[PDB]
């Protein structure tokens, strides 16, 4: 789990949620998992680099 690269469509989606709530809850990042064929591990650690900016 070094650098995945997200599509436009996938980080588009992510914007959105970080401007909602900038915090992820497991159920949160359990869906946003299923919707974007991200694991869950990725989604996470680009909720936390995205709050550390």
């Known amino acids: 789990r070094p ?3 997200f599509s ?3 980080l588009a989606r992510l ?3 970080f401007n909602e709530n ?4 497991e159920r ?3 869906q946003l998992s299923s919707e ?3 694991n869950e591990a990725q989604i ?3 909720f936390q680099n995205e709050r550390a900016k």
């Open 44 to 46: 996470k650690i680009w």
């Open 28 to 30: 949160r990042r359990q």
């Open 36 to 38: 974007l064929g991200l």
């Open 8 to 10: 436009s469509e996938q």
């Open 15 to 17: 914007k959105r949620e």
């Open 3 to 5: 650098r995945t690269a």
């Open 22 to 25: 900038r915090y992820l809850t």
